[model samples]
Target chain A: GSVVKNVDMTEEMQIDAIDCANQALQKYNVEKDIAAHIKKEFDRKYDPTWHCVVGRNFGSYVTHETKNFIYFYIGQVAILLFKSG
Target chain B: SVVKNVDMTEEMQIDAIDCANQALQKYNVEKDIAAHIKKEFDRKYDPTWHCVVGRNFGSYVTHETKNFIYFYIGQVAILLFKSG
Candidate 1:
């Protein structure tokens, strides 16, 4: 009973990622703002060099720091986050 | 001048920057520029590439270590990365 379609992150971090994304989407209706919000939250919570992509349609293949990537959907929009060097 | 996050090669980095410049000149919208860059990059280098072009955005991505580039052209930022 969740919107997390696919994820490659730890259980705890996944919870945090989804939490931040939920809050961001709730706070902003714009995709860009939501993406920016998640990215910033992760950047502050974890560290610098976090990236995010939020949209409805995109095909991606990326190499994220181990245990630092998640791909999930909130309604029709999808959010991708990973920590990169 | 660039704010590189991924450690792509000089040639790859320059190519991405150059492609973005050309796209910026040809397209006026952020989505189109991103699309053009992604298309050109996928065809020119590899397949299944992704791009996001915007000024007010943040990202955490895992790209092919050598197949990613993040930089700005004017006020717009270009993020080009391949699908792993």
Candidate 2:
């Protein structure tokens, strides 16, 4: 649903990865499945209660990152900070 | 720096999350700091980079899968993959 880039990496590489992944996702139209997997990942990260809090922030950050542009991959998903310009 | 475990759940509970975080830097033995952190997560997984087609194979598929494994809040080292 949203994209997340960590605090360390460059904005460009992360953006590129997101762009590529977004194109692939749209072309593949697996947004639903992708979201499912992402949910699973998050669920795995935190418990139900704690996960809700962390997941909420994660969503917020990811939303803020990808709100502008789209497209992403596994790696870029981690470093991602913002969408393309 | 050689700790990897992944597959199955429920058994980990709190340890699972702890081990998962170890994905940050669990493989290396020298980093005593990370060594302590490794115990917190549940499990970790790393693809064996074998050499067959003369490719030499690369370690940590996550690096290429996502490039930078550790997009961590602080130290984002192997969080992605391959001694980068």
Candidate 3:
């Protein structure tokens, strides 16, 4: 059984996390697996969003392997929904 | 009494500003106008709307103006009933 964590996310944190990832790549000289693992961990920690772009998006926190799991990224780029109250 | 150099009546300025007098036009300024203006200043000075709107709406700023008077249209438009 998988569980999801509830947290409020913001754009500021996302940019900070992406900066962190870029830094780690430069510092540790990590190539593929390590970067992927770190990226996954960061994504899990702070979710990004895209509410203002295409359409109004809404969803609940659900586990990856859970029955209600939705594909965050369907295409080339990573898909993220905007945060709302 | 007419011997003075200045014969201008003080009552004229008071009479001129009268509601019925043609020297000045009269109208109403609804709560919405004040609210909108207050909201604008609040938006510029304070990013928070909830607190600003509440404070302005609840305070003396909502109505009562003689100096910075606001005017808009007609007599039938007045909803308040005041006896003659």
Candidate 4:
């Protein structure tokens, strides 16, 4: 994520997401593939049930635990990741 | 009108992917897709289901557990989760 934004999360979570996303950006180009890199990284880091989506075109209908959702941009392409059951 | 409200946005997003599939349902529009999901939830389980769709937008929210789905479609994503 080049520019960072947090809907609800901790400083550590946001920073880590960016770092992990940057790593993914270096490796993947497809939106679907990029999402896996981030979600998998978080699974190892937090062990939480995390979901992710990546693309310029996005749609969502979400209800998540408080402070567990995050939406940010990595250039024009955005990344939305949230944790839930 | 695009805001980085959520993730899953990338310009270099498409490559070698065609002929469509489950995720390739990009032909669907965001509002219809978003509202479509919300209505399903509303019919299945009654409650205040708020859903928004777009490529970019910022939102501050909280939702019930096991009731929210941050869905990603083609160029936009839908964020319509329950609040109660």
- Which candidate number has the best DockQ? 4
Off by over 4 Å in 3: A1-9, A33-85, B1-84
Alpha carbon lDDT at B17, candidate 1: 86
Which consecutive 10 residues in model 2 chain A have the weakest lDDT in total?
Answer: A48-57
lDDT of each: 0.66, 0.28, 0.25, 0.55
What order do candidates take by TM-score, descending? 4, 1, 2, 3
All candidates: DockQ: 0.04, 0.02, 0.01, 0.08
TM-score for chain B considered on its own, for each of the candidates? 0.76, 0.22, 0.24, 0.44
- Report the CA-based lDDT of candidate 3 relative to the real structure: 0.25
Over 4 Å off, model 2: A1-8, A30-85, B1-14, B17-84
Predicted model with the maximum lDDT: 1
- TM-score for chain A as predicted in candidate 3: 0.31
Please rank every candidate by DockQ, starting with the best.
4, 1, 2, 3
Q: What is the lDDT of candidate 1?
A: 0.66
TM-score of chain A of each: 0.74, 0.28, 0.31, 0.77
TM-score of each: 0.50, 0.23, 0.20, 0.52
Per-residue lDDT of model 2, residues A1-85, tens digit only: 2232233324664454445444444554344444444334333432221111111113322111111211123433331222211
**lDDT tens readout by residue for model 3, A25-76:** 4565333433444445454654432121100121222111111111121122
What value does the lDDT take at residue B46 in candidate 3? 41
Candidate 1, superposed: residue stretches over 4 Å from native: A1-85, B1-7, B55-66
